[PDB]
């Protein structure tokens, strides 16, 4: 019997708001460590990784280990029946093909209950290639959302370039070109660099990876040349959320 | 049935006719005219193929059917016409495919259509489903047309409300009866004189043909030979019909084998289908649903804007 | 000569906003008791009774038992052209088949004077029965709308179980089964399930969404049911009268 309680359930709604437009079907891994997701998207580009650790979990129980399969869309659908102070109680059995979900209000007068079915699946897995990263940058989140949305209006790709002093994103489209640089802060931004590197990315999936903005206040971009870039967000004191995109050659 | 009737109504009281979708009839028990029905399919496994499919579609939409057969026919016009000069094989072959599907059936003492009406006006069934407006003449409150049409012919069912017809034409049932007769009954010869619309008017200020005749009398509008304008007016009133309460129809469960072993086998026909068919029939086991306000509150009347 | 005034006049906008999606027409019965409206629905499942007493008005002159008919959605489109603080005035001549609407302003500087023509009506009319309703529930309207809309994303028709301790709003759907339980809370946010004998009934949740269109229309919503009878939802139009929606039950 697996049981779990998260009293910041609104977070999980936004967590499902990370996926329900990006990937529709995935597999959920449950161990004593917590909840884990390592999925591939439909156009075979993004490596989507999500970690929630059970140190941040307020109430936990996991004897037998689970590897289930969920349509993430309808889970986001059934998660939207609770206000923004509520508690989610998850409970899944070692022999039953379900999730039993209890929306618990803090004022325990209106309590919602759902029983969602399961699907055993064969989604191919891909892990994290651990390497170094020659340039890391940490920036605020709404400004990056504004930047990626705006450069999606001029052209369909983005050429980024980082160096000793600042960073630059550029794009060229039908009505001309544009670029925006930022400078090293001496709310702020940081760069730790090893080489001035330039690469090319497709803004459609940056507009897909953007939607995890209100799960964090800041955002981390970690990158080198000839290897994919990591867009990284932090789930507060429980885990994190990575989107991996391989740059255009 | 009655001639040019549908048009007459359509042309002078459309408020009594509606073009509804087969689905809206979910939960309704209807009386059908097996005879005409069986015939419709023909115009030789058809007498049952349609008797099959159609009844499935009628079930699939929540409509609970009760096929009806005729008994000893009465004095119909062209009926006893050849007598002026002097089978049930593929018929009962149907009275079988039915109980083998768990579908009721009743042997009318004479004309089913009259019996159907008999039921309808007893709460025992919702409407009567035939192609002949007769039912209306016989006093039936609701008549449904096209409920036996092909799945193809995307024709919606046509409903008729007697109590709305009577409403507009401002005339009692009986008064309506005479109209049907002068419109073209299949029981007796009409009167070469009056026209569709014309026949109405007369009846409107002459609550009977008996009074209509003595009025217009020239050799310009002569009354038929052996005019039984009476005998008929009677049939449409008090026909020969099995009492409504006499029995309670109960839709049973279809017997896949016993039936499929008396269809695709004994009458040879694509198995794959008649199997998925019996399957579907078995699924749609019900129809009645959602009540009306009528069901609980007496109708007060009508508020009409000044 | 009909000539009537309403200072807090946002209620008329509020009732016809909850009237036009249900039905296309209305039988306006103006009596010396005030403004009334009994009218069926279009699907032959439901009914609206609006009663507006004269003592809930400001200034009144009724000389005729007028019985007129209004095409509702065009009247609502005209009512969309006036604010909610604005005073609503109606004028009517018993020979001139028109409605003269006068929208006064609270600052009186913007004057509106609209006119909608009349159409004839021969609407059906049935009487409601008066009986014992085995469960009468007083509820907040916003919470009620929130709950039934929360059930709208599960399935289509609702099953209700009305008993002593709690009340049970259950439903099925394409994602499975669900139900929410309520209890009494020990003036507007207070609830009360007054009960004699527990029942179970079937109703249409889409008609509950249609009935909760009058969510801002009262202090509290009342839900009155018994065995195999029309549910009457009540919105008590404050100091004015009341609007009651009947729903004939399901089988």
Author numbering:
A (entry chain G): 1 to 186, 193 to 255
B (entry chain H): 2 to 44, 60 to 102, 134 to 353
C (entry chain E): 1 to 186, 191 to 255
What's the publication's text?
Three DNA polymerases (Pols), α, δ, and ε replicate the genomic DNA in eukaryotes, with the latter two possessing the proofreading exonuclease activity required for high fidelity DNA synthesis. PCNA encircles the duplex DNA and tethers Pol δ to the DNA enhancing its processivity from few nucleotides to hundreds of nucleotides per DNA binding event. Mammalian Pol δ consists of a catalytic subunit and three regulatory subunits. The catalytic subunit (p125) harbours the polymerase and exonuclease activities, and a metal-binding C-terminal domain (CTD).
In addition, we present the structure of the Pol δ–DNA–PCNA–FEN1 complex at 4.0 Å resolution. We obtained a reconstruction at 4.0 Å resolution in which the mutual positions of Pol δ, DNA, and PCNA are analogous to those of the processive Pol δ holoenzyme while FEN1 fills the space between the N-terminal and palm domains of the p125 subunit, where the ssDNA template enters the active site, and the unoccupied PIP-box site on PCNA. Our structure suggests that the proximity of FEN1 to the template strand and the potential interaction between FEN1 and Pol δ may facilitate their products handoff during nick translation. The preferential binding of FEN1 to the more exposed PIP-box site on PCNA indicates that DNA Ligase 1 (Lig1) would be sterically excluded during nick translation reaction and that its binding requires Pol δ to move out of the way.
